[PDB]
Every structure is written in structure tokens, then in C-alpha cells.
């Protein structure tokens, strides 16, 4: 359950790291160990008729998922408190900022170097998917770095707000997420599973290489329609110096039919991620990220 004590008895809290919807995040320090965490205050709705907070079901689900996950590439949950108005998640402090903002600062980035970071996301998803957990909100802002000032920065996937344990024997259908990142089955209210994360990874990879967004249109409805139609191009302006292997990887991910979409286990075996001969390995070193445009992307 959730500790019914004053978190202020156990933590010192300070600067605001962020906020959104019905939550604020503060940096905090555990008094008994002196260790630093993130404290996330989530407003309870309190009455069902209220649209001014988060329902207990949703908090319960997220927390229950967070309780299970123990993997270097996903945030860890330390503790959970509850008071009259909030549930308070004490979360592993993830301070490296957004992966993309960190990549937007290099001068150059080989596909080989790109796959270094991308493989870290795959490993994180491999684990979640191995536990039957769909994240359902994979997008660039949810790919953080634990610490930016080390030679080999580690990726942490965060924000399990939309995540679900997949239930054999009960279809799950819903609309949610960010239009340019959601799979067609989310747009069309079709059944949802692990496969929807694989679509989103395709989108991320496409942006990582190009600085361009695959399905983004001039309006929400246009973006939704591009997605449902799988209407995307490898526009020559953006994919000039991008290998076939990289393009094959994305093509096997951006696939309307979930049953034909590449799986996490397969993507880890794909030649672009795991070169199976010397030609492919060199192709990876040779081609690069469209970094001029990519930087423009990180502009937001």
C-alpha cells in the first residue's frame, strides 16, 4: 500500500524539476541515507465527477507497474506516500535531460553511434515487453539520460502514465498519446498490445536519423490521417546520407498491421542493430545522422 506518513518527515524537498497535467516534480533528499531522489506529487481527483485530478485506478495501475520494473534502462520507484490530496512517488532521480537535447550538441553522429543509444532503448523495451508491459507513450521526451557527464551515458525510459500490463483474454482499446507518435491501432480504436511500442520506436528512429517527423502534418486531424494511412516518405532532402539498413529497420516498424510489425526480439536481431557481416558493419560507420536538420529539430 501507500505509506500514510508525512513525506516531509522523511525527505527534504527543493527545486521544481517540472510539471504537467495534475503533477509537479520536486528534487528531494532522503534524510536517513542522504541520497537524492525525484518526488512526484500527483493530485487525486477525490470525487468521481471531478476532472481536476487523477483517478485512483490510474495511479494504482502505474504504481503497480513501477513496482515490478528493475532494469538499468527504466526509472526505478523508491517509495510511495499518500496524503489527503496527493499520491507521492519517490522516484530515481534522472538528471541527464532528454536524449535528443544531448545528441543535438554533438557536431557529428554516425549511424554506428546512433545505434549505441538506440540499442539502449531496445533493451529497455525488451525487458518491459518480456514482462508483458506496454509503455504506450514512447516518444523522444520520455527518453532521458541518467547522467550526461560520463563517457558512456545511460538511457532511462520514464513516464509510465499510459502503460498497461497486457491481459490475455481481454482486449484493450483506447485513444490517447501524442498523435505523431501513436500507432494506427490507437488512432482507429483497434485492439492494443505490445506492438504499438514498436511503431513508436520506428518513429523515434526516423526522427533520430533525419530531424524530420514521419507523420506530422499541418493539423491534428491531418497527422492522425497520415498515421492511419501510413503515409510517410524517406524524403531525399533528409535521408541523403542514410543507409539502406537503417531504412529497412524503420520500414519493418512502420507497418499498419500489428501482427506483421517487427517485434522487440526481432529488432534486436536486425542487421542494422546487429551487423552480421563486415560490409554492413562498415555501412554503419560510413553513413550518418542528418545533423544540421536534426539540430533544427531539437529546437522545438
UniProtKB/Swiss-Prot annotation:
PTM (free text): Ubiquitinated by the BCR(KLHL20) E3 ubiquitin ligase complex, leading to its degradation by the proteasome. Removal of the C-terminal tail of isoform 2 (corresponding to amino acids 296-337 of isoform 2) by proteolytic cleavage stimulates maximally its membrane-blebbing function.
Domain Protein kinase, chain residue ranges per copy: 11-273
Active site: 137 (proton acceptor)
Region (Autoinhibitory domain): 290-299
Modified residues (Phosphoserine): 287
Tissues where this protein is expressed: Isoform 2 is expressed in normal intestinal tissue as well as in colorectal carcinomas.
Stimuli inducing this protein: Up-regulated following treatment with IFNG/IFN-gamma.
Residues at which ATP binds: 17-25, 40, 92-94, 98, 159
Domain notes: The autoinhibitory domain sterically blocks the substrate peptide-binding site by making both hydrophobic and electrostatic contacts with the kinase core.
Family stated for the protein in its record: Belongs to the protein kinase superfamily. CAMK Ser/Thr protein kinase family. DAP kinase subfamily.
Role played: Calcium/calmodulin-dependent serine/threonine kinase involved in multiple cellular signaling pathways that trigger cell survival, apoptosis, and autophagy. Regulates both type I apoptotic and type II autophagic cell deaths signal, depending on the cellular setting. The former is caspase-dependent, while the latter is caspase-independent and is characterized by the accumulation of autophagic vesicles. Phosphorylates PIN1 resulting in inhibition of its catalytic activity, nuclear localization, and cellular function. Phosphorylates TPM1, enhancing stress fiber formation in endothelial cells. Isoform 2 cannot induce apoptosis but can induce membrane blebbing.
Subunit relationships: Interacts with KLHL20. Interacts (via death domain) with MAPK1 and MAPK3. Interacts with MAP1B (via N-terminus). Interacts with PRKD1 in an oxidative stress-regulated manner. Interacts with PIN1, PDCD6, BECN1, TSC2 and STX1A. Interacts (via kinase domain) with DAPK3 (via kinase domain). Interacts with GRINB. Interacts (via death domain) with UNC5B (via death domain). Interacts with UNC5C (via death domain).
Protein name per UniProt: Death-associated protein kinase 1
Organism: Homo sapiens
Amino acid at each position: 500500500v501507500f505509506r500514510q506518513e508525512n513525506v516531509d518527515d522523511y525527505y527534504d524537498t527543493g527545486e521544481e524539476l517540472g510539471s504537467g497535467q495534475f503533477a509537479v516534480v520536486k528534487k528531494c533528499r532522503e534524510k536517513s541515507t542522504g541520497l537524492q531522489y525525484a518526488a512526484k506529487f500527483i493530485k487525486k481527483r477525490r470525487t468521481k465527477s471531478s476532472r481536476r485530478g487523477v483517478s485512483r485506478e490510474d495511479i494504482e495501475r502505474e504504481v503497480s507497474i513501477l513496482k515490478e520494473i528493475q532494469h538499468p534502462n527504466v526509472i526505478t520507484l523508491h517509495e510511495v506516500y499518500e496524503n489527503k490530496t496527493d499520491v507521492i512517488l519517490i522516484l530515481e532521480l534522472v538528471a541527464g535531460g532528454e536524449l535528443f537535447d544531448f545528441l543535438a550538441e554533438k557536431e557529428s553522429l554516425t549511424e554506428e553511434e546512433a545505434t549505441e543509444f538506440l540499442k539502449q532503448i531496445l533493451n529497455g523495451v525488451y525487458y518491459l515487453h518480456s514482462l508483458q508491459i506496454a509503455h504506450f507513450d514512447l516518444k523522444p521526451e520520455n527518453i532521458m539520460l541518467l547522467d550526461r557527464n560520463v563517457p558512456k551515458p545511460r538511457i532511462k525510459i520514464i513516464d509510465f502514465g499510459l502503460a498497461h500490463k497486457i491481459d490475455f483474454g481481454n482486449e484493450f482499446k483506447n485513444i490517447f498519446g501524442t498523435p505523431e507518435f501513436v500507432a494506427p491501432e490507437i488512432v482507429n480504436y483497434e485492439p492494443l498490445g505490445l506492438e504499438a511500442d514498436m511503431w513508436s520506436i520506428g518513429v523515434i528512429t526516423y526522427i533520430l536519423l533525419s530531424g524530420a517527423s514521419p507523420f506530422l502534418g499541418d493539423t491534428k486531424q491531418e497527422t492522425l490521417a497520415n498515421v492511419s494511412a501510413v503515409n510517410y516518405e524517406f524524403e531525399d532532402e533528409y535521408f541523403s546520407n542514410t543507409s539502406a539498413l537503417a531504412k529497412d529497420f524503420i520500414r519493418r516498424l512502420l507497418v499498419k498491421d500489428p501482427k506483421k510489425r517487427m517485434t522487440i526480439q526481432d529488432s534486436l536481431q536486425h542487421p542494422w542493430i546487429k551487423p552480421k557481416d563486415t560490409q554492413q558493419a562498415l555501412s554503419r560507420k560510413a553513413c550518418a545522422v542528418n545533423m544540421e536538420k536534426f539540430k533544427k529539430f531539437a529546437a522545438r
